[PDB]
Amino acid sequence: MLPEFPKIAVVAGSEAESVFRVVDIGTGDVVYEGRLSDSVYDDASGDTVRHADFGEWKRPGSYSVTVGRSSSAPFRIGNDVYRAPLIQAARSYTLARCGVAIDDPVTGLRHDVCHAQDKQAMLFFEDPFHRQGDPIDVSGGWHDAGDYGKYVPTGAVAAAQLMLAWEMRPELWRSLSLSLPAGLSEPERRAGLPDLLVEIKYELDWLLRMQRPDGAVYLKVAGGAWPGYIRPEEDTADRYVFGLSTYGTAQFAGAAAMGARVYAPFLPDYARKLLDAAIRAQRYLEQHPDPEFRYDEGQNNGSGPYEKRTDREERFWAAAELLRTTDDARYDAYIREHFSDFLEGKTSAVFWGNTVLLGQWAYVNAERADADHKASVRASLTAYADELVRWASANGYRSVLRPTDYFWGSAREAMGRAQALLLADAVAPNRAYLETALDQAHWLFGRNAAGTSFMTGIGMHSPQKPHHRLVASTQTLIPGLVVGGPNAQGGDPIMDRLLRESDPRVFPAKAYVDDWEAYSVNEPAIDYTAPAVFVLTRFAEDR
Ligand SMILES: [Zn+2]
């Protein structure tokens, strides 16, 4: 943890104790003694929780908290503590690349070129531009999660979140090396593009390939069956382009419009290419105002559904990001005509099924947005942030999750909520927003009822058997990956059995197991890691 921020140790049990000691491990000296807070029952975990507050101790070092007979694992106080996990999480995207060979000396991850057949992936249906079965080059991009499919909604939202991390602290990222393996992104590296932007461009390049001539965007690339726990270069079965959706077309437009702004200082032609693509997508959407989600039978036989049959929050993001990037006030008129509700409220954490906050963030940073409506959107952000602070401040684990929030992707949700707190802090600075955001990083790294980090490679306990075909087939730790997190609703055979057989029933915050097949809680995905990168950006030391 950081010298200038709050410092609590959360203790489950230990009801009979009254005091704690913070001990410097190098000297054995007690640097701080205090009284424990009162024990309070935590609904989501079933734990009775108290905490040791030593925030006023600011000296860097390695320490342990003693309570009664027990002493915590060593932990650090230091300004530099979040730089390493930020770097690991960001470079994990490089290690997820598809269509290239990877030989990474940092982790030892090695694989041959994978999914070369994506250069001729077959369209699963007939459309005005391709006969069914016709090949399209949709190579490149990132493998989505523990599988090797590539999906526009999560690709666009993850890329956007990473670009917002760039925009939060460009000077941090200009001097941050991701130790890109040999052979990767050679033209971009020769041009001196910052490593984070090199990596994001690999995904944007792929997203561009998913757009068809009329501006609409296909849904995903995958096979007709799920591969086993095999290296990606062994997944030789035919690959297809599946689906067509307006919500994904709009997310593509948002990501491309954001990329146009982000890349313009570096690559004027590429930035223009992104902006023109974003506008073709927006024009498709304006001419096709009703939502579409195409479903052909079999398209989910080897890949996830990522189904949304409405699209308002994503159309709003597309228009608002275009407003921000282009300064064309016609987008403000369009937004005020169709999306006035999102200018007055409805803030919610970013995820692939709801990008309202990406749109609100774009709007409040748009020079040509109406000033009174920008004020309204700032108030929507602060109302949501204030709610998160209220929840976390009264929660024994300082968590922004409620008992009913332990659904698939809860760890993403915790970090998406932290992201929202940081965006609120940007428009209306408030130390409570910063501190509560940082509390979700403490939670993510293991200060939680499950007793484990949900980011690989970090924490006394962390996921060692993530549902991840590359990790499993190569037996190589890839640090920095965020797994779904505790999920009391089930969805895989391991969790389904645990939840149905347990008596007493499992408490939602503990509905997690570290097993290869527990994909409803233990699978990492690009859109889980992305908000973690964003949040850690704020707290990482520059140099
Ligand atoms: Zn691949």
Residue numbers in the entry: 1 to 543
List passages from the publication reporting this PDB structure:
J30, an endoglucanase with activity against p-nitrophenyl cellobiose (pNPC), which produces cellobiose as its primary product, was identified and analyzed from metagenomic data originating from a switchgrass-adapted microbial community. Its likely source is the moderately thermophilic bacterium Thermobacillus composti KWC4, and its catalytic optimum is 50°C. It is annotated as a GH family 9 member consisting of an N-terminal Ig-like domain and a C-terminal catalytic domain. The predominant architectural element of the catalytic domain is an (α/α)6-barrel structure composed of 12 α-helices arranged in an alternating pattern as is typical within GH family 9 as well as other families.
Using the CtCel9A crystal structure as a reference model and comparing the geometry of its Zn2+-binding site with the corresponding segments within J30, we created a mutant called J30 CCH (denoting the residue identities of the mutations: A98C, G114C and Y143H). The crystal structure of J30 CCH was solved to a resolution of 1.46 Å. The crystal structure of the triple mutant showed the successful introduction of a Zn2+ ion at the intended binding site. The Zn2+ ion is located at a distance of 14 Å from the center of the active site towards what would correspond to the reducing end of the bound substrate. The root-mean-square deviation between the backbone C, N and Cα atoms of the crystal structures of the wild-type and triple-mutant enzymes is 0.094 Å, i.e. they are virtually identical. In the crystal structure of J30 CCH we observe a lower average isotropic B factor than in the crystal structure of J30 wt. The local atomic displacement parameters of the residues neighboring residues 98, 114 and 143 show a similar trend, suggesting stabilization of the mutated site through the introduction of the Zn2+ ion. Our design of a mutant version of J30 based on structural data further underlines this relationship. Here, the majority of the increase in stability is likely to be a result of the net exchange of a hydrogen bond between the side chains of His115 and Tyr143 (J30 wt) for four coordinating bonds between the Zn2+ ion and the side chains of Cys98, Cys114, His115 and His143 (J30 CCH). The incorporation of the Zn2+ ion increases the temperature optimum of J30 for pNPC turnover by 5–10°C, and its influence on catalysis is merely physical and not chemical.
